Design an enzyme around this catalytic site. Structure first.
Site, PDB file in Angstrom:
ATOM      1  N   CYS A 179       2.586  -2.038 -20.369  1.00 55.62           N
ATOM      2  CA  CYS A 179       3.303  -1.411 -19.261  1.00 55.62           C
ATOM      3  C   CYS A 179       4.687  -2.014 -19.104  1.00 55.62           C
ATOM      4  O   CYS A 179       5.672  -1.275 -18.899  1.00 55.62           O
ATOM      5  CB  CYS A 179       2.497  -1.429 -17.968  1.00 55.62           C
ATOM      6  SG  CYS A 179       1.087  -0.293 -18.135  1.00 55.62           S
TER       7      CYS A 179
ATOM      8  N   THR B 117      -4.881   3.844   5.190  1.00 59.03           N
ATOM      9  CA  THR B 117      -5.576   3.499   3.941  1.00 59.03           C
ATOM     10  C   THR B 117      -6.905   4.187   3.885  1.00 59.03           C
ATOM     11  O   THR B 117      -7.493   4.485   4.921  1.00 59.03           O
ATOM     12  CB  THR B 117      -5.989   2.012   3.849  1.00 59.03           C
ATOM     13  OG1 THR B 117      -5.256   1.221   4.787  1.00 59.03           O
ATOM     14  CG2 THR B 117      -5.814   1.486   2.431  1.00 59.03           C
ATOM     15  N   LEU B 118      -7.403   4.382   2.668  1.00 58.34           N
ATOM     16  CA  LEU B 118      -8.803   4.728   2.463  1.00 58.34           C
ATOM     17  C   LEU B 118      -9.664   3.497   2.098  1.00 58.34           C
ATOM     18  O   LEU B 118     -10.847   3.641   1.795  1.00 58.34           O
ATOM     19  CB  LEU B 118      -8.930   5.845   1.418  1.00 58.34           C
ATOM     20  CG  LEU B 118      -8.825   7.301   1.881  1.00 58.34           C
ATOM     21  CD1 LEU B 118      -8.560   8.172   0.643  1.00 58.34           C
ATOM     22  CD2 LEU B 118     -10.088   7.761   2.608  1.00 58.34           C
TER      23      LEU B 118
ATOM     24  N   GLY C 240      -0.640  -4.312   4.344  1.00 60.13           N
ATOM     25  CA  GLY C 240       0.133  -4.207   5.558  1.00 60.13           C
ATOM     26  C   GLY C 240       1.462  -4.913   5.594  1.00 60.13           C
ATOM     27  O   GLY C 240       2.112  -4.947   6.643  1.00 60.13           O
TER      28      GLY C 240
ATOM     29  N   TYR D 213       0.221  -5.103  -5.152  1.00 63.04           N
ATOM     30  CA  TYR D 213       0.011  -4.518  -6.451  1.00 63.04           C
ATOM     31  C   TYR D 213       0.974  -3.344  -6.568  1.00 63.04           C
ATOM     32  O   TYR D 213       0.569  -2.169  -6.529  1.00 63.04           O
ATOM     33  CB  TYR D 213      -1.425  -4.053  -6.554  1.00 63.04           C
ATOM     34  CG  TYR D 213      -1.926  -3.771  -7.941  1.00 63.04           C
ATOM     35  CD1 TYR D 213      -1.370  -4.382  -9.065  1.00 63.04           C
ATOM     36  CD2 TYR D 213      -3.034  -2.942  -8.125  1.00 63.04           C
ATOM     37  CE1 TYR D 213      -1.898  -4.142 -10.341  1.00 63.04           C
ATOM     38  CE2 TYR D 213      -3.572  -2.707  -9.391  1.00 63.04           C
ATOM     39  CZ  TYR D 213      -3.004  -3.310 -10.484  1.00 63.04           C
ATOM     40  OH  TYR D 213      -3.517  -3.039 -11.708  1.00 63.04           O
TER      41      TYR D 213
ATOM     42  N   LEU E  80       5.523   6.112   9.728  1.00 61.11           N
ATOM     43  CA  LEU E  80       4.242   6.259   9.084  1.00 61.11           C
ATOM     44  C   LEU E  80       4.323   5.677   7.663  1.00 61.11           C
ATOM     45  O   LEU E  80       5.155   6.123   6.863  1.00 61.11           O
ATOM     46  CB  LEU E  80       3.833   7.731   9.038  1.00 61.11           C
ATOM     47  CG  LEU E  80       2.632   8.028   8.157  1.00 61.11           C
ATOM     48  CD1 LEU E  80       1.349   7.621   8.837  1.00 61.11           C
ATOM     49  CD2 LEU E  80       2.608   9.495   7.854  1.00 61.11           C
TER      50      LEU E  80
ATOM     51  N   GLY F  97      -0.530   4.909   2.642  1.00 60.54           N
ATOM     52  CA  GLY F  97      -1.090   3.915   1.720  1.00 60.54           C
ATOM     53  C   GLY F  97      -0.471   2.564   2.014  1.00 60.54           C
ATOM     54  O   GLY F  97       0.407   2.087   1.299  1.00 60.54           O
TER      55      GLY F  97
END
Length: 373
Positions: free
Chosen positions: A339, A177-178, A159, A115, A152, A155
């Site tokens: 968009c 990630t959160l 993966g 996304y 690093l 976000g």
């Protein structure tokens, strides 16, 4: 209300002829030529509503089927963004939550579930999977990554960037990630190659990873979520996680003309989201003592990405309209097409910033020939 107010608004909104049918059944064409887009107001939207936020007013109206459109929504909006006096641009017009998850995204995103903006090489016109893979290579190449150095990814999504760095660039990789759902593709490390010696993922907030530092930082699609107030902090965090003379590639939607939040997007799609200005971003970068080493604009690539997403969305709309309402589908289609238009018209851009912690480009080749495949 006022036919005068509507004529003022609509007749100054588009660089091409448009047909408008009003709530009383009457019609007019604004412009010369034969209209490719026909706008029908099934109901009067109060002037005062349009006057305070046209995006919100016209946008909900459209969702509610009180405005209908024959012809491209994208072209309609692209049109409005090209006109200084339009409902999207003039200041005269700038005085619900749906349950969605992976079933939804699965239908219109590529197999990868990215996304985020894709990257279209001259040989690839609409292969979305191929373009999301190419984007990852485009980002990683910019690093001139050295075998055995650490990366690093802030976000890390599902993966794709992380794992490509580990499998194809020989990089010791950390993803963050959160999202639990996303984290649980640690199962790819264990199953892939216990890629465990070369890749970890962590379910935590990137804002405090303590004292660790990496040779490289990547971050795709994070800073749009941060807000104006914390943008400074974001870049200080990027700097903090970089080794001295280390290289970051920061990637994000940026607005050449100055930062903005759109009221409709904020209410329906990305509450709290903010697109920073180009000047704004460069300032934040400099204030963290990173030096800009390269800047690439990928505007037209996001436009294509969003066009294909919308094509995919519409192709699966019967399925989606079964679970979610008609109202949801209208909203989502409006979102994707507006968009796309926002990029098409150059109202919004996407930018890859190659940053170094120290003098610009110090640990990198002298010329950019290394970048391109």
């Amino acid at each position: 209300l006022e036919k005068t107010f509507y004529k003022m608004m609509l007749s100054k909104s588009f660089p091409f002829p448009v047909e408008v049918t009003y709530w009383d059944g009457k019609s007019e064409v604004y412009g010369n030529g034969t209209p490719e887009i026909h706008i029908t107001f099934n109901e009067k939207i109060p002037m005062s509503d349009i006057t305070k936020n046209a995006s919100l007013a016209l946008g909900e109206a459209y969702m509610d089927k009180k405005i209908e459109i024959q012809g491209s929504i994208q072209e309609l909006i692209n049109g409005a963004y090209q006109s200084a006096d339009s409902f999207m641009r003039s200041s005269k017009f700038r005085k619900s939550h749906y349950d969605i998850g992976n079933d939804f995204y699965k239908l219109w995103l590529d197999p990868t579930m990215t996304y985020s903006c894709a990257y279209f090489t001259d040989d690839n016109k609409d292969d979305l999977e191929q373009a999301q893979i190419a984007k990852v290579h485009h980002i990683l190449n910019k690093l001139h990554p050295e075998k055995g150095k650490t990366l690093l990814d802030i976000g890390c999504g599902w993966g794709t960037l992380m794992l490509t760095a580990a499998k194809e660039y020989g990089l010791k990789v950390t993803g963050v990630t959160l999202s639990e759902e996303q984290y649980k593709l640690v199962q790819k490390k264990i199953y892939d190659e216990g890629l465990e010696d070369v890749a970890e993922v962590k379910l935590e907030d990137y804002r405090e990873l303590g004292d660790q530092q990496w040779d490289y930082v990547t971050s795709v699609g994070m800073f749009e979520h941060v807000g104006s107030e914390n943008l400074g902090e974001y870049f200080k965090d990027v700097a903090k996680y970089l080794k001295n003379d280390g290289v970051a590639l920061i990637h994000g939607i940026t607005r050449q003309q100055g930062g903005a939040t759109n009221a409709w997007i904020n209410k329906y799609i990305f509450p709290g989201g903010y697109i920073p200005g180009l000047v704004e971003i460069i300032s934040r970068i400099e204030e963290a003592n990173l030096q800009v080493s390269d800047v690439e604009m990928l505007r037209r690539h996001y436009q294509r990405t969003l066009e294909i997403w919308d094509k995919n969305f519409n192709n699966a709309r019967p399925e989606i309209e079964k679970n979610m309402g008609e109202r949801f589908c209208r909203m989502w289609d409006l979102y994707l097409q507006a968009c796309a238009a926002s990029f098409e018209s150059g109202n919004i851009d996407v930018v890859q910033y190659l940053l170094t912690k120290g003098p610009s480009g110090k640990s990198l080749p002298m010329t950019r020939k290394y970048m391109l495949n």
